[PDB]
């Protein structure tokens, strides 16, 4: 049908059809008479998977022969989503499979909807890892993603009576065609035990053993025949485990629980033992794999020349003392040499400045679980603090501030401090965030080792986030400037010369309308909700957190409702306000915010006076597959975090690429987005970081705003009195109390400017032509936000490797 989806050749279509029929018979053990849509999905998945294998084997043997420097990306989260369409896109198989399935009497888009998301992440951090894997393969880097194969990913969210309910995401129920179990490469991981000092160094003895079994998933690059590997470890009990008999076998579950479930906290630290076990499990298994592969190329001087380890936040921070453990205790290297190798091998990416998200492990936990690692951490701290003392003599408070060990009621290890000490590079994820790191939380470290500190602004893959989810936009762009931009997104700048092109303006607006129609149809089918497709689609989708200020959005929604009710016969630009996102199961306030949103919807959506002018919808079970549907349909992207709180954001970039305009604070990557597009083409409002600082120095008093803004006062009085909960008048008392007395994120302080800015959005939307011209200027300047740019920078500035767009032989 469309050009960017590749060729549908007679030979290819014929071959795909026969392999589809082969798999249905031999693999699924079904015939066309009893086969269901799910059977058809699996037959298609196996058919496409077959095309990966040759490339996968030859890529990995190529790395063995050429022996390039290997990049190991360690993460506790990989939010991969669906794999079928992505694989077809990267292999240029989409049109061919579309034709083949059509000739078999099947609709491929229907089949694609059957696949479960691989939901092995919480949101932004996990999705970044996934975009990064795609870019690393596209840029021909010898890269390996390493993590945990959770049996249960992020929970499925159900909404019952306006409240979030959680259910287990049993994503492996029907099997995972994309993974290859590798039980032959199983590795032992040690826990507990004790340290024994001998004539020749320390020994870690009397340990409990858990086995780490790897599952490998292919990661295809964009049309370059490169297929890299994501290796995820699964926990297994040894066969003599606990070996009355029956209970011993049943107790194997205790060891195997390590890989059972993803912790569902977004930007929050929970110091549970099981989480620590997960973190060591991934690190210990991965490092053995790294060392084995290095030895199969004695001389560890060359280790940093052949190995780069990237720590995705502090979650895999134990890699630092684990590498030291292996080099000192097992390989018999002297401390100083081992440390030099470790520092040159490891690099650390920080993803947030929120204090509650920072990992600070109680010493007593590490003492019991990982006694040798604690000893190593103490020794690292002593040697590091000796360096600080030499550089800043007499500065005793600096010594306590910089220590890896924090004193108090319970002694803790600061994992961020550990990472900085043991890494040659430390980066933030957007320019403003990286600057905040050097100015505030890591100021002392920057002063000691300025060369260590870098910025690497986040990005998103244009394969998943344009070509896959928005083929219509990809096609109209390709019609004018060709296909090269898909792996070189800076080429979108060429679209600036089409901003006054009448045909292009029409096409851009047509594509958006088509996307909105499709999404309005999706909503009616799966959720029985009706929306006006001519209204402005106002979208805020992201995890529910106070810092992200879904509450500020709520206040605007109520303002709009109250203004309509005051002047019902006055014209207003119609809006569909969509808010979606999951709350962490133990985060009470986040769960109350979800309830508020649905409660507002219950009032607004059923008021006859409002009509079709305002609709408020909560998007249930927000996840990667849903993002692919809603983002192409959006007109307005809500990126309204308090300045200085969102390290980068990546959702923001997805909306920019897909033809939505942005309303946002000068926070995270929003700053760079506005810089790229021009401030005139962005709806910027509210306090800057400096303004938040001034308010903090003075003391934030919410009452002041309540007293001086009558429209704001009305809303608070409505919430308190039970206007949005008639049967339970005091339901939202916690929310009002927080807003009025202990709001860390200053919702009221940005209210007036936010409402004002929203009026300017509505004004522009009244002029379709000028709205679309501004959209074109956003799409055209979104190139910087490709994860190909991000990864090229990591490669050149941290890892010391050169990217390559050269094809491997097919």
Ligand X SMILES: O=[N+]([O-])c1ccc(C2C[C@]3(ON2)O[C@H](CO)[C@@H](O)[C@H](O)[C@H]3O)cc1
Q: State yes or no: 794 annotated in a binding site.
A: no
Question: By C-alpha distance, which of 6, 1, 142 is closest to 63?
Answer: 142
Cα 107 → chain centroid: 31
Closer residue to ligand X (CB): 84 or 660: 660
Which single residue is written with the structure tokens 């906290």? 265
Site for ligand X in 654-713 (CB under 6 A): 668
Q: State yes or no: 295 annotated in a binding site.
A: yes
Closer residue to ligand X (CB): 448 or 544: 544
Q: Point out which residues bind its own copies (CB under 8 A).
A: 25-26, 29-31, 36, 38, 50, 53-54, 56-57, 61, 152, 155-156, 165-168, 170, 173-175, 180-181, 183-184, 236-237, 239-241, 243-246, 249-250, 252-253, 257, 260-261, 263-264, 272, 274, 585-586
- Count of residues of this chain found to bind ligand X when the rule CB under 6 A is applied: 21
336 binds, among its own copies, ligand X, none (CB under 5 to 8 A by kind): none
240 binds, among ligand X, its own copies, none (CB under 5 to 8 A by kind): its own copies
223 binds, among ligand X, its own copies, none (CB under 5 to 8 A by kind): none
Q: State yes or no: 297 annotated in a binding site.
A: yes
Q: State yes or no: 31 annotated in a binding site.
A: yes
- Beta strand 453-455 with 360-362 is unpaired
Closer residue to its own copies (CB): 274 or 521: 274
One of 83, 122, 535, 778 touching ligand X (CB under 6 A)? 122
If one counts every other C-beta atom within 10 angstroms of the C-beta of residue 197, the result is: 9
Closer residue to its own copies (CB): 152 or 453: 152
Closer residue to its own copies (CB): 186 or 605: 186
One of 125, 415, 541, 552 touching ligand X (CB under 6 A)? 125
Which single residue is written with the structure tokens 């084995």? 292
Least separation in angstroms between residue 155's CB and its own copies is 7
> What angle, 0 to 180 degrees and rounded to 10, lies between the N-to-C axes of helices 550-566 and 751-765?
70
The edge-to-edge listing of strands for the beta sheet with 405-406 is 360-362, 412-414, 405-406
Q: State yes or no: 245 annotated in a binding site.
A: no
Kindly tell me the sign of the dihedral angle through the C-alpha atoms of 330, 331, 333, 338: negative
Interacting residues of 800 by C-beta distance below 8 A, sequence separation 6+? 69, 308
Which single residue is written with the structure tokens 């898909």? 486
Q: Is 791 in the site for ligand X (CB under 6 A)?
A: no
Q: Is 644 in the site for ligand X (CB under 6 A)?
A: no
Q: What does the DSSP 8-state code read for residue 676?
A: H
Q: Is 642 in the site for ligand X (CB under 6 A)?
A: no
Least separation in angstroms between residue 280's CB and its own copies is 18
Q: State yes or no: 602 annotated in a binding site.
A: no
350 binds, among ligand X, its own copies, none (CB under 5 to 8 A by kind): none
Interacting residues of 79 by C-beta distance below 8 A, sequence separation 6+? 118, 119, 120, 121, 122, 123, 126, 127, 129, 130, 154, 624
Q: State yes or no: 547 annotated in a binding site.
A: no
Closer residue to ligand X (CB): 277 or 372: 277
Question: By C-alpha distance, which of 371, 365, 318, 323 is closest to 206?
Answer: 371
One of 422, 581, 649, 664 touching ligand X (CB under 6 A)? 649
One of 119, 123, 177, 304 touching ligand X (CB under 6 A)? 123
57 binds, among ligand X, its own copies, none (CB under 5 to 8 A by kind): its own copies
One of 59, 458, 550, 793 touching ligand X (CB under 6 A)? 458
If one counts every other C-beta atom within 10 angstroms of the C-beta of residue 106, the result is: 18
Q: Which positions are annotated as active-site residues? A: 351, 542-543, 548, 650, 654
Q: Which two tokens stand for residue 325?
A: 């453990």
29 binds, among ligand X, its own copies, none (CB under 5 to 8 A by kind): its own copies
Q: What are phi and psi of 97, to 5 degrees?
A: -70, -35
Least separation in angstroms between residue 243's CB and its own copies is 6
One of 39, 538, 646, 676 touching ligand X (CB under 6 A)? 646
Closer residue to ligand X (CB): 95 or 670: 670
Least separation in angstroms between residue 152's CB and ligand X is 15
Closer residue to its own copies (CB): 268 or 378: 268
Q: Which stretch binds ligand X (CB under 6 A): 513-521, 526-534, 577-585, 648-656?
A: 648-656
If one counts every other C-beta atom within 10 angstroms of the C-beta of residue 334, the result is: 10
Closer residue to its own copies (CB): 152 or 771: 152
Q: Which stretch binds ligand X (CB under 6 A): 124-132, 196-204, 470-478, 765-773?
A: 124-132
Cα–Cα dist 784/671, whole Å: 13
Q: Are 148 and 674 in contact (CB under 8 A)?
A: no
Site for ligand X in 161-180 (CB under 6 A): none
One of 94, 115, 313, 750 touching ligand X (CB under 6 A)? 313
Least separation in angstroms between residue 267's CB and its own copies is 17
Q: State yes or no: 453 annotated in a binding site.
A: no
Site for ligand X in 410-429 (CB under 6 A): 429
Closer residue to ligand X (CB): 214 or 668: 668
Cα–Cα dist 513/632, whole Å: 10
Q: What does the DSSP 8-state code read for residue 152?
A: B
Q: Are 315 and 269 in contact (CB under 8 A)?
A: no
152 binds, among ligand X, its own copies, none (CB under 5 to 8 A by kind): its own copies
Least separation in angstroms between residue 584's CB and ligand X is 10
401 binds, among its own copies, ligand X, none (CB under 5 to 8 A by kind): none
Alpha helices, H only, 201-318: 245-250, 252-256, 273-295, 303-306
Q: Is 778 in the site for ligand X (CB under 6 A)?
A: no
Site for ligand X in 212-271 (CB under 6 A): 265-267, 269
Q: Is 523 helix (H, G, I), strand (E, B) or coil?
A: helix
Q: Which two tokens stand for residue 672?
A: 């760079």
Q: Are 536 and 576 in contact (CB under 8 A)?
A: yes
Closer residue to its own copies (CB): 152 or 348: 152
- Reduce the secondary structure of 583-646 to three states and give it as a string: CCCCCHHHHHHHHHHHHHHHHHCCCCCCCCCEEEEEECCCCHHHHHHHHHHCCEEEECCCCCCC
Site for ligand X in 357-396 (CB under 6 A): 357
257 binds, among its own copies, ligand X, none (CB under 5 to 8 A by kind): its own copies
Q: Are 796 and 312 in contact (CB under 8 A)?
A: no
668 binds, among ligand X, its own copies, none (CB under 5 to 8 A by kind): ligand X
Least separation in angstroms between residue 412's CB and ligand X is 16
Q: Is 142 helix (H, G, I), strand (E, B) or coil?
A: coil
Least separation in angstroms between residue 282's CB and ligand X is 13
213 bridge partner residues: 234
Interacting residues of 570 by C-beta distance below 8 A, sequence separation 6+? 564
Integer CA distances (angstroms), 798 to 304, 728, 792, 793, 802, in order: 12, 56, 10, 8, 11
Least separation in angstroms between residue 4's CB and its own copies is 29
Question: By C-alpha distance, which of 391, 287, 364, 359 is closest to 329?
Answer: 287
Question: By C-alpha distance, which of 790, 795, 799, 807 is closest to 128?
Answer: 790
Q: What are phi and psi of 18, to 5 degrees?
A: -75, -35
Cα–Cα dist 763/573, whole Å: 8
If one counts every other C-beta atom within 10 angstroms of the C-beta of residue 779, the result is: 21
429 binds, among ligand X, its own copies, none (CB under 5 to 8 A by kind): ligand X
Q: What does the DSSP 8-state code read for residue 261?
A: B
Which residue positions form the known binding site?
31, 64, 292-297
The footprint of ligand X (CB under 6 A) covers: 122-125, 128, 265-267, 269, 313, 351-352, 357, 429, 458, 646-650, 668
Which residue positions form the known binding site for AMP?
31, 64, 292-297
């Amino acid at each position: 049908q469309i050009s960017v989806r590749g060729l549908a050749g007679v030979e290819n279509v014929t071959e795909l059809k026969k392999n589809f029929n082969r798999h249905l018979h031999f693999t699924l053990v079904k015939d066309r008479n009893v086969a269901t849509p799910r059977d058809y999905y699996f037959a298609l998945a196996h058919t496409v998977r077959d095309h990966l294998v040759g490339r996968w084997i030859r890529t990995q043997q190529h790395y063995y022969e050429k022996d390039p420097k290997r990049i190991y990306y360690l993460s506790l989260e990989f939010y991969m989503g669906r794999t079928l369409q992505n694989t077809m896109v990267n292999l240029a198989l989409e049109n061919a499979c579309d034709e083949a399935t059509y000739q078999l009497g099947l609709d491929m888009e229907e089949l694609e909807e059957i696949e479960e998301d691989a939901g092995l992440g919480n949101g932004g951090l996990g999705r970044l890892a996934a975009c990064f894997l795609d870019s690393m393969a596209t840029l021909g880097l010898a890269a390996y993603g390493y993590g945990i194969r959770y049996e249960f990913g992020i929970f499925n969210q159900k909404i019952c009576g306006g409240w979030q309910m959680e259910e287990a995401d049993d994503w492996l129920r029907y099997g995972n065609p994309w993974e290859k179990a590798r039980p032959e490469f199983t590795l032992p991981v040690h826990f507990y035990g004790r340290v024994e000092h001998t004539s020749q160094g320390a020994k870690w003895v009397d340990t409990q053993v858990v086995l780490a079994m790897p599952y490998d998933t292919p990661v295809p690059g964009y049309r370059n025949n490169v297929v890299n590997t994501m290796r995820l470890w699964s926990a297994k009990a040894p066969n003599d485990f606990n070996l009355g008999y029956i209970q011993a076998v049943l107790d194997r579950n205790l060891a195997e629980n390590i890989s059972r479930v993803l912790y569902p906290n977004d930007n929050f630290f929970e110091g549970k033992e099981l989480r620590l076990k997960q973190e060591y499990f991934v690190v210990a298994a991965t490092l053995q794999d790294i060392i084995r592969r290095f030895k199969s190329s004695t001389n560890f001087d060359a280790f940093p020349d052949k190995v780069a380890i990237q720590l995705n936040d502090t979650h895999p921070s134990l890699a630092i003392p684990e590498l030291m453990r292996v080099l000192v205790d097992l390989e018999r290297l002297d401390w100083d040499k081992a440390w030099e190798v470790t520092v040159k091998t490891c690099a650390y990416t920080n993803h947030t400045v929120l204090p509650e998200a920072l990992e600070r492990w109680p010493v007593h936990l590490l003492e019991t679980l990982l006694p040798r690692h604690l000893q190593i951490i103490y020794e690292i701290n002593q040697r590091f603090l000796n360096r600080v003392a030499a550089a800043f003599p007499g500065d005793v408070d600096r010594l306590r501030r910089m220590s890896l060990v924090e004193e108090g009621a319970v002694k803790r290890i600061n994992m961020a401090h550990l990472c900085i000490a043991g890494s040659h590079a430390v980066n933030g994820v957007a320019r403003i965030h990286s600057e905040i790191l050097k100015k505030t939380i890591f100021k002392d470290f920057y002063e000691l080792e300025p060369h260590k500190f870098q910025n690497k602004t986040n990005g998103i893959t244009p394969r998943r986030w344009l070509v896959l989810c928005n083929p219509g936009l990809a096609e109209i762009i390709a019609e004018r400037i060709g296909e090269e931009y898909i792996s070189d997104l800076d080429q979108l700048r060429k679209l600036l010369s089409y901003v006054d092109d009448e045909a292009f303006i029409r096409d851009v607006a047509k594509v958006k309308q088509e996307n909105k129609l499709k999404f309005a149809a999706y909503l009616e089918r799966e959720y029985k909700v009706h929306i006006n497709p001519n209204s402005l689609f106002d979208v805020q989708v992201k995890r529910i957190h106070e810092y992200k200020r879904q509450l500020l959005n709520c206040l605007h929604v109520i303002t709009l409702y109250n203004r309509i009710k005051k002047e019902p016969n006055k014209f207003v630009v119609p809006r569909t306000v969509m808010i979606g996102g999951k709350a962490a199961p133990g985060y009470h306030m986040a769960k109350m915010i979800i309830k508020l949103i649905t409660a507002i919807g219950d009032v607004v959506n059923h008021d006859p006076v409002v009509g079709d002018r305002l609709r408020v919808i909560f998007l249930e079970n927000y996840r990667v597959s849903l993002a692919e549907k809603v983002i192409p349909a959006a007109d307005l992207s809500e990126q309204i975090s308090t300045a200085g709180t969102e390290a980068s954001g990546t959702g923001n970039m997805k909306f920019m690429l897909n033809g939505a305009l942005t309303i946002g604070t000068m926070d995270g990557a929003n700053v760079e987005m506005a810089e790229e597009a021009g401030e005139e083409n962005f709806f910027i409002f509210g306090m800057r970081v400096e303004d938040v600082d001034r308010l903090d120095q003075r003391g934030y008093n919410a009452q002041e705003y309540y007293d001086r803004i009558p429209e704001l006062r009305q809303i608070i009085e409505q919430l308190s009195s039970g206007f949005f909960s008639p049967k339970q008048p005091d339901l939202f008392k916690d929310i009002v109390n927080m807003l009025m007395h202990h709001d860390r994120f200053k919702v009221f302080a940005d209210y007036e400017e936010y409402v004002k800015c929203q009026e300017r959005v509505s004004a522009l939307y009244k002029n379709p032509r000028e709205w679309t011209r501004m959209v074109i200027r956003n799409i055209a300047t979104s190139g910087k936000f490709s994860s190909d740019r991000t990864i090229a920078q990591y490669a050149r500035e941290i890892w010391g490797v050169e990217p390559s767009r050269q094809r491997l032989p097919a």
